[PDB]
Design a protein around this ligand. Structure first.
Ligand SMILES: O=c1cnn([C@@H]2O[C@H](COP(=O)(O)O)[C@@H](O)[C@H]2O)c(=O)[nH]1
Ligand SMILES: O=c1cnn([C@@H]2O[C@H](COP(=O)(O)O)[C@@H](O)[C@H]2O)c(=O)[nH]1
Ligand SMILES: [Cl-]
Ligand SMILES: [Cl-]
Ligand SMILES: [Cl-]
Ligand SMILES: [Cl-]
Ligand SMILES: [Mg+2]
Ligand SMILES: [Mg+2]
Lengths: 220, 219
């Protein structure tokens, strides 16, 4: 009852040039059927980039927009994003339950999915987010959230998040490669890993993706 | 310090280009600063920012609630300033490195970062509020000079002003629709942000005029 992510690998396509983003995504298409598109690409090339990716590749689209506004604005952001063809959207939990519920309501109405970001993968996440993360996760469970994002860079924290959300929830995890998270270790807890720079900055992105997949072969 | 006409910033969150341009045009004599967010940008494209500057000459604050890792924050700020935004709103909750990433790009491109410390909606009480004073102190430590705090809790807005000092610039949303009072908010904030009370009004011009009339002794 979850999205079927090919090879447990999601491409974080954060190149800001349309031609480059299209080239690299095309090059790794045989390995990946799920692409995470964020604001670096969307603010550079427009929401029609989601359309273009759909048309060009057979890929699901997760809009990594880290939605973090008041409920009224969150609703509008989700509506615009799903209208453009995103399958799912990533939403911050730290602004509270009403802000998350606004996103869930739009997703329910529009037949799409919310991913709740609990803890983040970068060093600064330790300052405020980490201390709230278990409660944000528990809040997500109470709100009926089924999809979550947690940090590969902190295996102990990722393990705890998996415990809180349960085995049935879907968990994806960034911070793999460039930020130091290990693909295999991360897949102990996450359903899929998110990988950006390790793939898209490689001299041969296809070889990079193939290499990650070979390293996790027995987990597929 | 940014000089906001009438201490009033229009939150232009209409999602149609024609309506957004028409309504902004109707209130142009009252404002010179417009806050543009994702509702309009995701619906009409980042080119709308240059169009606002071409039509109105207004300052543009990009309310993008920037809340990613430092590397991604850098890219978001670069794309946003390339589109002609004068300033960007950044969440403090993701920590100091994420804020510093934004400050670096703003310095490079001659723009400003506004640090959002406490939000105006009820859910802000769950996690943000208890971190807000510390987020503000982090802003001070980082050399942030521009801040955003909640009209809906004037005691919290006053505390934010206390932390950042009189020299810092403070703008405040939640006025009107969310219940904040224009005059009370301006006791502590340099400028108020107003969206729906203006842009959903039967007569936006009269709405803006009315707000300004209510604070005329503060201008
Ligand atoms: O806690 C998080 C949440 N999201 N991302 C996003 O995941 C991707 C990671 O890419 P990378 O492999 O190049 O580090 C980027 O798009 C980044 O904004 C994180 O890195 N950490
Ligand atoms: O703590 C915050 C931060 N930002 N905003 C933004 O300020 C505007 C408020 O508009 P309104 O007057 O229509 O409520 C909207 O764009 C909203 O996303 C808030 O309302 N509260
Ligand atoms: Cl709201
Ligand atoms: Cl930090
Ligand atoms: Cl980073
Ligand atoms: Cl709430
Ligand atoms: Mg310079
Ligand atoms: Mg008055």
């Amino acid at each position: 009852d979850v999205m079927d992510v090919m090879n447990r690998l999601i491409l974080a396509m954060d190149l800001m040039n349309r031609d480059d983003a299209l080239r690299v995504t095309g090059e790794v298409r045989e390995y990946i059927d799920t692409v995470k598109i964020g604001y670096p690409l969307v603010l550079s090339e427009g929401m029609d980039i989601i359309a273009e990716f759909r048309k060009r590749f057979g890929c699901r689209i997760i809009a990594d927009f880290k939605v973090a506004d008041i409920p009224e604005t969150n609703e509008k952001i989700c509506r615009a994003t799903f209208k453009a063809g995103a399958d799912a959207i990533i939403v911050h939990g730290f602004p509270g339950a009403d802000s998350v519920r606004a996103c869930l309501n739009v997703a329910e109405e529009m037949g799409r999915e919310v991913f709740l970001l609990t803890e983040m993968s970068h060093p600064g996440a330790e300052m405020f987010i980490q201390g709230a993360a278990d409660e944000i996760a528990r809040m997500g469970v109470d709100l009926g959230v089924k999809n979550y994002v947690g940090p590969s860079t902190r295996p102990e924290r990722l393990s705890r998040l998996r415990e809180i959300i349960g085995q049935d929830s879907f968990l994806i995890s960034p911070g793999v490669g460039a930020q130091g998270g290990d693909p295999g270790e991360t897949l102990r807890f996450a359903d899929a890993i998110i990988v950006g720079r390790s793939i898209y900055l490689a001299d041969n992105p296809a070889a990079a993706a193939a290499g990650i997949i070979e390293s996790i072969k027995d987990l597929l």
